[PDB]
């Protein structure tokens, strides 16, 4: 109970067997695998009370499990399909409902890896009119053209991550909503004082961590192989 899960992030094509591994150190009899989906909470897949004991939860179809050791509980997607895209949590419990959750596995299942694509990222500089009207300055970051929807956006000011003054949309939008494999876009705002924007020594960077293909994955297109990578855009402060 340092409960640990691997992997943390994974993208897979449909029709592949995928394994997620849960390990604990306290040796509790009881271990669980749940999936979390928006609007549905955490739904139980399978659970185990000992190496000889496996029990179905509400959504066991399409999954299997094995309890390899007191310490280990493995979850398999037997033949991955897109509706198995989810955040997966393992948990342990003591005999009095004391639960410990792992930190989660974000898994995305896509039909076709050829559609994977890293974002283009652009920073848009504050409006002079905002500056004059409010003595504040809002930068906008726009990440566009990415697939799948499996990114993390952050802002970096003079080389250090910032959380203050930031708002990032909670979900990307579909650029072509009628399409099952539409690419996505995401915006974020960083607002600072006008005087801080007006200092030409200050450096502002929007960073997008993209999760995509691995070194293992085949790539047959002329375009860049869309590997897991960071894409950033930047702006310097400006007196004029």
């Amino acid at each position: 109970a340092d409960v640990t899960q691997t992997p943390r992030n994974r993208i897979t094509k449909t029709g592949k067997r995928i394994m997620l591994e849960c390990s604990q150190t306290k040796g509790h009899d009881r271990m669980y695998w749940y999936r979390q989906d928006p609007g549905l909470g955490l739904r139980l897949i399978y659970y185990s009370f000992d190496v000889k004991d496996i029990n179905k939860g509400e959504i066991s179809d399409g999954y299997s499990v094995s309890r390899q050791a007191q310490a280990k509980f493995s979850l398999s997607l037997e033949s991955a399909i897109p509706n198995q895209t989810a955040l997966y949590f393992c948990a342990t419990s003591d005999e009095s409902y004391g639960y410990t959750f792992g930190s989660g596995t974000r898994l995305t299942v896509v039909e076709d890896l050829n559609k994977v694509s890293p974002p283009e990222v652009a920073v848009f500089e504050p409006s002079e009119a905002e500056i004059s009207h409010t003595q504040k300055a809002t930068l906008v970051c726009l990440a566009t053209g990415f697939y799948p929807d499996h990114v993390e956006l952050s802002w970096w000011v003079n080389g250090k991550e910032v959380h203050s003054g930031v708002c990032t949309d909670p979900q990307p939008l579909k650029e072509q909503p009628a399409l099952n494999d539409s690419r996505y876009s995401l915006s974020s705002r960083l607002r600072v004082s006008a005087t801080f924007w007006q200092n030409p020594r200050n450096h502002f960077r929007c960073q997008v961590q993209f999760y995509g293909l691995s070194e293992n994955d085949e790539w047959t297109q002329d375009r860049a192989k869309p590997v897991t990578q960071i894409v950033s855009a930047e702006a310097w402060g400006r007196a004029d």
Partner: protein, 202 residues
């Protein structure tokens, strides 16, 4: 047989007002009950639980919940809503002597108290070479909400609240953009009901 019900996927509270998140259960025998929070980007954290001891259960950060058998309820409350309370909250219950089952979750949205609104639509330019721009609708109060675009080539985000700690200042905004030649920030938000005094610079 046994379930747990949370009322509303998304709920609002005014900054400073009483927080109330409702949970009801269907077990005949009283169960153990749990409230978990999931702050943006993170896993689950236990706030409090009812484990057949006290019926008024106190938790971390001023949270409390009262177990009421006669109304099969365990509502979570906090006396004052703070911007940091924005998160998703899950009620859960013991089941079958062997597991915890979770409710569907409720996301709490905190409406900032905007005492001096200054609604405006600004045009921002790409820091790189560009006839590329976006439009920023900002500084409106709680009574404004943003509608989706009616043009499939104009993208509009939900409103988002930012908390500038440097100036102890919160503000709402939405972003709009398009690749179209005839896209102007004066028209970007025409499908939204915007304040009559919205500022449209030059």
């Amino acid at each position: 047989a046994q379930s747990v019900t949370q009322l509303g996927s998304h709920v609002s509270v005014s900054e400073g007002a009483l927080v109330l998140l409702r949970c009801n259960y269907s077990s005949s025998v009283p169960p153990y009950l749990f409230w978990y929070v999931q702050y943006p980007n993170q896993g689950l954290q236990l706030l409090l639980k009812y484990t057949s001891a006290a019926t008024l259960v106190k938790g971390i950060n001023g949270f409390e919940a009262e177990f009421k058998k006669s109304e099969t309820s365990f509502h979570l409350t906090k006396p004052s809503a703070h911007m940091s309370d924005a998160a998703e909250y899950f009620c859960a219950v013991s089941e079958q002597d062997d597991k915890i089952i979770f409710g569907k979750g409720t996301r709490l949205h905190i409406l900032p108290n905007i005492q001096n609104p200054d609604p405006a639509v600004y045009q921002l330019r790409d820091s790189k070479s560009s006839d590329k721009s976006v439009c920023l609708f900002t500084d409106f109060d709680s009574q404004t909400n943003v509608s989706q675009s009616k043009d499939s080539d104009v993208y509009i985000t939900d409103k988002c609240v930012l908390d500038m700690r440097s100036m102890d200042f919160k503000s709402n905004s939405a972003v709009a953009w398009s690749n179209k030649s005839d896209f102007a920030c004066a028209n970007a938000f025409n499908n939204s009901i915007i304040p009559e005094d919205t500022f449209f610079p030059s």
